[PDB]
Design an enzyme around this catalytic site. Structure first.
Site: not given
Ligand SMILES: CCCOc1ccc(NC(=O)[C@@H]2CC(=O)Nc3ccccc32)cc1OCCC
Ligand SMILES: CCCOc1ccc(NC(=O)[C@@H]2CC(=O)Nc3ccccc32)cc1OCCC
Ligand SMILES: [Br-]
Ligand SMILES: [Br-]
Ligand SMILES: [Br-]
Ligand SMILES: [Cl-]
Ligand code: NA
Lengths: 306, 301
Positions: A41, A143, A145
Site C-alpha cells: 500500500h 507511521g 505500517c
Molecule cells: C489501500 C488501503 C490501505 O488502507 C490503509 C493503509 C494504511 C493505514 N494506516 C494505519 O492504519 C495507520 C497504522 C495503524 O495501525 N493505526 C493508525 C492510526 C491512525 C492513523 C494511521 C494509522 C490504514 C489503512 O486502511 C484503514 C481501513 C482498513
C-alpha cells in the site's frame, strides 16, 4: 518468581528496520540481506484506497521512485517485485546486521513480540497474540505500517507478522512475510469487520498452570470434566473450543504441577461461574489469554512452588 | 489506537551484557567502556552470604579470581574494586558497543525496562515500576542477578537498576548502577521483607487519561475536587499522596484531553469509593499504576 508479559530482546530486529518512501508516503521496511520488505500500500495515493489495482500502480514505478533510508544512509533500489501484499525492493547493499532468520505463518493463539517503529526508528517492544478472528490488539499510530512481529527462540529470528492497517474497531491487520493476510482481510478501505472475538482457552489454561507453578492453588476444585462437557460450557462464555491437540500441548505443564488437564479445565469452568471473589491470579483480576503453553515454559521455573 | 505495556527497544543494552564468574557463582555483568559492573555478592560462598564482611572478602580476591565472558571471548580482568554494593572489574578491552549512557537513580513510581539475562545472554524484556516500597514486581529466576533496568532518551541509555535479590514474597530488590540499594535492603542472608505497598496515584491518573484518549469515558462525571479532599481519599485507600508537582506533570495529558487533573481526580475518587460496577478500563478490572504520565504521552503521540 513473578510473571510478566515478556518480549524477546529486540536488537536483532532493530538492526533490520529502514524507512521506505514512495511518493508522499513514508513507512517502515524490513532489510534482510539485499531485500527490503514493506506493505504494498506504500504505492497508493488518496484515490487508490478503495479499489487499487496494484499491478497497474506498480508497473508505473521505476526503481528510483523508491527511497530507502537506513539510519542516515540512502540505499539504492536496483529491483522491485510484489509478492501477494508485500513489496520487495532489491537494494545494492546487503544488511551487514542481518540476523539468522526465517519466515513463519502462525495460527490463532500464537504470540509474538512487536517492534513498533516510526520513520524506520524503533519506538518500543510489546507482546501480542494472533486473535481467533485473525486480528491483533496492537498499539499503533500513523507511521507504524511495516512494523514487524517475531519470536527469537534458539537465537533464530522467526518473523511472523508485518503490520498493514488499523480496522475501524481499533484492532490491527497484517500479513506474514510472504505477504498473505492473516484472516479474510484485504488491503482496501472497504468494510471488512473482524468476526466477534473469542477467548483463547488453551492459553488461559496455560496461565492457570503458571499460577500453580508460581505457588497459587486457591482456584482449584475437587471436580473433573469430560472434554465435551468442558467445551459445551466454555462456548457459553465465548471461549474457543479446546481440542485434543491443545490437551496434548498442556501435557508438560500438567506433569510439572500434578494437575491433570481436565482437572484444570474443571477449575476454569468454576472460575467462569464464580469470578475471583476479590482475589487475583498472577496480579490479574481477569483471566489472561495471551500467554501460550510454550510462553509459560519459557518464563516460569521448572520447579513448582508446592 | 490501542494501549499496551511497552518496553524500550533493548538492542543498545544487549551489546553490554557479559557473564561474570567468581568461583562456583555465575551471574550477569554490564560492560561499558573498560569496566564490568555486577553485584558484589558474586564474591560470596553460601556460608559468606549469611554474614558477609565484604571489605575482607574482597581483600582475599585477586583479578585472576574473576572470569568475564562476552559471547565466546574471555575479557582479561586487570583491576577490581567495589562501589557500594557493586563490583567494578577493569578489563583489558573497551566495549566497542558502549552506547551513550548515564547512570540515573530513579524515584518510586518511575518505570523502566528490564533486560532479563541468564549466563550473560539476554532472554527477555519487560516493563517494571519502582514501587513505593522500593521493590519491583519483576520476573526473575536463578541466574538473573546483574540483569539491568533502563530508560532511553534520544540515543542516551539511562541505566537505573541492577538486579540483586528476590524477597520472600517473590518481589525483587536491587541497586542503582553506583551500588546504592533501592529500599531498606542489604546484600546478606537475614530476615528481609517488602514493607506494605501503596498505589502510585499519579500513574493511575495518567492511565485514566490514556483510557479517555482511547475512547473509554464511562467513569467521567460532572464533579471536581480539591487536592486536600482528594488526598484524604487517597490516604484512606492506600494510595500515594498527589502533590502539586504531580498535577503539573499531568498538564500535557490534561492539555491533550482537556480534562483538568482535579476533574479526573473526582473520577478516581468515585472509582475508589464505588468500584467499577462490573466494567473495565482499557481491558483491565484493576486500576493500573505502572504507566507514568511520560509513558502515556510517549505511546499515545
Ligand atoms: C489501500 C488501503 C490501505 O488502507 C490503509 C493503509 C494504511 C493505514 N494506516 C494505519 O492504519 C495507520 C497504522 C495503524 O495501525 N493505526 C493508525 C492510526 C491512525 C492513523 C494511521 C494509522 C490504514 C489503512 O486502511 C484503514 C481501513 C482498513
Ligand atoms: C546477597 C544477597 C542476599 O543473598 C542472595 C543472593 C542471591 C539471590 N538470588 C536470587 O534471588 C535469584 C534471582 C531472583 O530474582 N530469583 C531467584 C529465584 C530462585 C533462585 C534464585 C533466584 C538471593 C539472595 O537472597 C534472597 C533473600 C534476600
Ligand atoms: Br455520577
Ligand atoms: Br463538584
Ligand atoms: Br485485570
Ligand atoms: Cl512522568
Ligand atoms: Na469529574
Amino acid at each position: 518468581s513473578g510473571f510478566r508479559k515478556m518480549a524477546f530482546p529486540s536488537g536483532k530486529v532493530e538492526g533490520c528496520m529502514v524507512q521506505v518512501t514512495c511518493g508522499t508516503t513514508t513507512l517502515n521496511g524490513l532489510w534482510l540481506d539485499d531485500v527490503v520488505y514493506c506493505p504494498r500500500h506504500v504505492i497508493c495515493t488518496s484515490e487508490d484506497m478503495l479499489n487499487p489495482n496494484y499491478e497497474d500502480l506498480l508497473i508505473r514505478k521505476s526503481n528510483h521512485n523508491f527511497l530507502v533510508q537506513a539510519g542516515n544512509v540512502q540505499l539504492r533500489v536496483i529491483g522491485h517485485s510484489m509478492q501477494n501484499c508485500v513489496l520487495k525492493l532489491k537494494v545494492d547493499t546487503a544488511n551487514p546486521k542481518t540476523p539468522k532468520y526465517k519466515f513463519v505463518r502462525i495460527q490463532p493463539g500464537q504470540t509474538f513480540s512487536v517492534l513498533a517503529c516510526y520513520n524506520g526508528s524503533p519506538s518500543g517492544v510489546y507482546q501480542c497474540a494472533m486473535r481467533p478472528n485473525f486480528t491483533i490488539k496492537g498499539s499503533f499510530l500513523n507511521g507504524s505500517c511495516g512494523s514487524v512481529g517475531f519470536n527469537i527462540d534458539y537465537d533464530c529470528v522467526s518473523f511472523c507478522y508485518m503490520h498493514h492497517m488499523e480496522l475501524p474497531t481499533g484492532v490491527h491487520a497484517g500479513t506474514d512475510l510472504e505477504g498473505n493476510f492473516y484472516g479474510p482481510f484485504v488491503d482496501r478501505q472497504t468494510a471488512q469487520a473482524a468476526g466477534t472475538d473469542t477467548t483463547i482457552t488453551v492459553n488461559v489454561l496455560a496461565w492457570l498452570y503458571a499460577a500453580v507453578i508460581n505457588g497459587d492453588r486457591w482456584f482449584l476444585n475437587r471436580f473433573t470434566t469430560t472434554l465435551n462437557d468442558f467445551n459445551l460450557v466454555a462456548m457459553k462464555y465465548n471461549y474457543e473450543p479446546l481440542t485434543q491437540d491443545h490437551v496434548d500441548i498442556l501435557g508438560p505443564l500438567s506433569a510439572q504441577t500434578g494437575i491433570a488437564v481436565l482437572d484444570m479445565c474443571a477449575s476454569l469452568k468454576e472460575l467462569l461461574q464464580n469470578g475471583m471473589n476479590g482475589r487475583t491470579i498472577l496480579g490479574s483480576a481477569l483471566l489472561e489469554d495471551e500467554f501460550t503453553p510454550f510462553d509459560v515454559v519459557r518464563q516460569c521455573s521448572g520447579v513448582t512452588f508446592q
